[PDB]
């Protein structure tokens, strides 16, 4: 069973480093049947935008662990809030980075 | 010795008050947190 793992990142270079990291950790650990597909989601500036992006393409990817980074503008730190919401609504933990 | 890791403006205001007054001499030492040291409270920072 493929596991799509979703990583919330800001520049494209973070997406390519994330996906090569996943490739290296698939070549590191078990790859016979546990093979992870890295998927990368950019930063939209709205928490309901985040909710909608993690719901329209990740929760049907069947994500096992989201990945979250600090909000661009440190005036209100509410970016990881909806994603912790959606993880925890069945109590899946978040990987705060 | 004082200690607080909070918002920067409070930092800054404490630093200004200690500067206008006599609390930067040899004896008034304290520790500071992470982000209060980058910005306006780094301009108002003491020497040491």
């Amino acid at each position: 069973k493929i596991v799509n793992i979703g990583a919330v990142l800001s520049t494209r270079k973070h997406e390519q480093m994330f996906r090569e990291a996943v490739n290296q950790a698939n070549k590191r650990h078990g790859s016979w049947k546990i093979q992870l597909n890295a998927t990368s989601v950019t930063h939209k500036p709205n928490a309901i935008q985040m909710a909608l992006s993690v719901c329209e393409d990740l929760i049907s990817s069947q994500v096992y662990a989201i990945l979250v980074s600090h909000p661009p503008t440190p005036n209100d730190h509410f970016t990881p809030t909806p994603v912790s919401y959606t993880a925890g609504f069945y109590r899946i933990p978040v990987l705060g980075l | 010795v004082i200690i607080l890791s909070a918002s920067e403006d409070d930092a800054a205001t404490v630093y200004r008050a200690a500067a206008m007054l006599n609390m930067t001499g040899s004896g008034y030492v304290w520790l500071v947190g992470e982000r209060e040291i980058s910005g306006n409270a780094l301009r108002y920072a003491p020497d040491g």
Partner: antibody, heavy 118, light 110 residues
Framework: DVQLQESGPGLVKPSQSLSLTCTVTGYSITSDYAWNWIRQFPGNKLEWMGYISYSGSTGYNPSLKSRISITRDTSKNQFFLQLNSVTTEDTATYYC????????????WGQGTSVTVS | IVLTQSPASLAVSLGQRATISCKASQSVDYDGNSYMNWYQQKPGQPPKLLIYAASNLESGIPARFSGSGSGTDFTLNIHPVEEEDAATYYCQQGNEDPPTFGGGTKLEIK
């Protein structure tokens, strides 16, 4: 190695918003550092307008409290400067210089570029 | 306030003193530590910070450009004077809004 890249219209029109653009290469705009915009005169007179911090703080001259703005984008590591309510007298050299946020280090200035108004 | 510099048409030989002072509007120096940086620029390259805090030299320059200052008057001195001493000197303050800059002092080695 971190360096800065200039860009702009090069010839602004009367009552037209000056749109400058500066790129950072080798680091990030949100992590650290602050960026000032300076208009150098031919008589060796640097005239700083305003600066943007990595936390989203726009500190500029009080005379420009309603006709200046600095925006940025982190996905492409870029930042724009918008100067409104401009007049004919703007012939100078633009510099998107970099000063460590908190008035700490003046390391990387850039190259800037001359500009006239006509 | 336009900061004043002095002198502007001096003539310093090789070996003697090259004192260059400048006056601001109010007391830039506060709590002992100065806040009057000294920038040396060569025409053709962007300016650079040469002396920070008006009493400390950054890592990368030998101990030639020294100086001090307080209140309004801040002084930069060169010991010894070399061929690269001839440049454009700007003393600059960055305390609060608006951080106005200094004028321009032209120094020529004889």
């Amino acid at each position: 190695d971190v360096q800065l890249q200039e860009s702009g219209p090069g010839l602004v029109k009367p009552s037209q918003s000056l749109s400058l653009t500066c790129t950072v290469t080798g680091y990030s705009i949100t992590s650290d550092y602050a960026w000032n915009w300076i208009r150098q005169f031919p008589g060796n007179k640097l005239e700083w307008m305003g600066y943007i911090s990595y936390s989203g703080s726009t500190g500029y001259n009080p005379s420009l409290k309603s006709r200046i703005s600095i925006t940025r984008d982190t996905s492409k590591n870029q930042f724009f400067l918008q100067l409104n309510s401009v007049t004919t007298e703007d012939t100078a050299t633009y510099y998107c210089a970099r000063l460590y946020y908190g008035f700490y280090g003046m390391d990387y200035w850039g190259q800037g570029t001359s500009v006239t108004v006509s | 306030i336009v900061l004043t510099q002095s002198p502007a048409s001096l003539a310093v030989s090789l070996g003697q003193r090259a004192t260059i002072s400048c006056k601001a509007s109010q007391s830039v120096d506060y709590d002992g530590n100065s806040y009057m940086n000294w920038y040396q620029q060569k025409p053709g390259q962007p300016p650079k910070l040469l002396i920070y805090a008006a009493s400390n030299l950054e890592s990368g320059i030998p101990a030639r450009f020294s100086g001090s200052g307080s209140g309004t008057d801040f002084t930069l001195n060169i010991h010894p004077v070399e061929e690269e001493d001839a440049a454009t000197y700007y003393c600059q303050q960055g305390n609060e809004d608006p951080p106005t800059f200094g004028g321009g002092t032209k120094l020529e080695i004889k």
